[PDB]
Amino acid sequence: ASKRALVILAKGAEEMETVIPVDVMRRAGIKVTVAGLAGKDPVQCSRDVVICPDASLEDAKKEGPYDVVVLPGGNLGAQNLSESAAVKEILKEQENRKGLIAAICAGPTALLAHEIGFGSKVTTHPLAKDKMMNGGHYTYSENRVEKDGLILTSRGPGTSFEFALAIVEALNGKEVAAQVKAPLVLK
Amino acid sequence: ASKRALVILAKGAEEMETVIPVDVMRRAGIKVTVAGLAGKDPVQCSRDVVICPDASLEDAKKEGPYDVVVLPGGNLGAQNLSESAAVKEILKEQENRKGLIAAICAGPTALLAHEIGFGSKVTTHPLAKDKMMNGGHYTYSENRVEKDGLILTSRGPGTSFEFALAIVEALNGKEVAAQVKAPLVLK
Numbered sequence: 312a313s314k315r316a317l318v319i320l321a322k323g324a325e326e327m328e329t330v331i332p333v334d335v336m337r338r339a340g341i342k343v344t345v346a347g348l349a350g351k352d353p354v355q356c357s358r359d360v361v362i363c364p365d366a367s368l369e370d371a372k373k374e375g376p377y378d379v380v381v382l383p384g385g386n387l388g389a390q391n392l393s394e395s396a397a398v399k400e401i402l403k404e405q406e407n408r409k410g411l412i413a414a415i416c417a418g419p420t421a422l423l424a425h426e427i428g429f430g431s432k433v434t435t436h437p438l439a440k441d442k443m444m445n446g447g448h449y450t451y452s453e454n455r456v457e458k459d460g461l462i463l464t465s466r467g468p469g470t471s472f473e474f475a476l477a478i479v480e481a482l483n484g485k486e487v488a489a490q491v492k493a494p495l496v497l498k
Numbered sequence: 499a500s501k502r503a504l505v506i507l508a509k510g511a512e513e514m515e516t517v518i519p520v521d522v523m524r525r526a527g528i529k530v531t532v533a534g535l536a537g538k539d540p541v542q543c544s545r546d547v548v549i550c551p552d553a554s555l556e557d558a559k560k561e562g563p564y565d566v567v568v569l570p571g572g573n574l575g576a577q578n579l580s581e582s583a584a585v586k587e588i589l590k591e592q593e594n595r596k597g598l599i600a601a602i603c604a605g606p607t608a609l610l611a612h613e614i615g616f617g618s619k620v621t622t623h624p625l626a627k628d629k630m631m632n633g634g635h636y637t638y639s640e641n642r643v644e645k646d647g648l649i650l651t652s653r654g655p656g657t658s659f660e661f662a663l664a665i666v667e668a669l670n671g672k673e674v675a676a677q678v679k680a681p682l683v684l685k
Contacts, residue, residue, distance in 0.1 A: 327514075
């Protein structure tokens with residue numbers, strides 16, 4: 312079987328947190344769709360790297376369901392994800408069907424904005440903790456990667472590989488994750 | 499002073515090895531130019547991530563000199579860099595002016611193709627070692643990041659942050675590198 316992943320790309324997204332998971336998941340044989348929040352046009356990321364999405368979020372959502380919905384970080388990117396009604400719908404449906412939801416660095420704050428996974432233990436970038444914890448709807452963790460059921464979170468660009476490999480393990484198992492990890496030269 | 503970096507992007511380049519250094523260098527205040535080898539059109543990377551270069555290599559080379567020329571990996575990308583006469587010229591001029599040259603994973607094999615930095619200690623991805631060592635023109639290292647004078651090399655996607663931070667330290671110093679590293683959440 313071939314798992315499917317939806318990565319939602321918005322203006323201001325952290326490019327490393329977008330590309331590392333996309334790349335690693337594809338190395339794991341996961342069919343990944345990089346969906347542009349604003350449409351099919353190129354997206355200017357946080358450090359000006361411009362990525363051309365595979366399709367618009369509008370079209371991509373029509374090709375669901377996905378085994379995992381991935382939310383990259385980047386403050387401005389996360390804010391755009393948090394303000395999107397389309398994102399809210401996708402996350403609510405994914406949660407309802409018991410599908411994996413993964414967010415990294417500032418990305419988890421989008422879960423808060425859409426009231427997703429309340430009651431879960433989560434982590435975020437240290438600078439995004441206060442925002443994420445507003446209201447005490449989650450229990451905070453300092454672990455590099457935190458997985459509480461179907462809510463998988465991570466802390467920053469530097470934890471992107473661990474984050475991606477955790478997604479791979481959840482979808483394709485520990486063996487596949489180990490096989491994909493080796494050639495990456497991660498110590 | 500504001501250092502300048504030239505990142506040469508070719509079809510088949512490893513997107514993580516392209517984006518991590520670009521992102522990290524920009525966080526370090528380095529003026530980075532993502533130059534498309536084939537032109538100004540979007541580049542399809544090794545794991546299908548499509549990046550739109552800031553400019554064509556042709557135009558970018560006219561805005562030199564650069565404090566560092568960066569060669570991402572990815573077998574097909576490295577091969578394209580190795581076959582480019584334009585790349586050969588840029589690297590030879592950078593070497594001649596005693597400018598830093600950085601290559602990662604499969605990227606160093608391009609140095610071999612253009613006879614750059616012979617006699618230097620270098621590292622590459624384990625799978626690129628035999629190609630790099632053809633003729634014994636370099637001395638091989640297993641270090642995650644190897645720097646011998648103006649030739650800086652690294653092993654793979656998983657060493658991209660160390661590689662990028664080494665470039666930052668060489669250009670802007672140890673203090674700046676430490677400041678940029680902290681928010682990345684690298685352990």
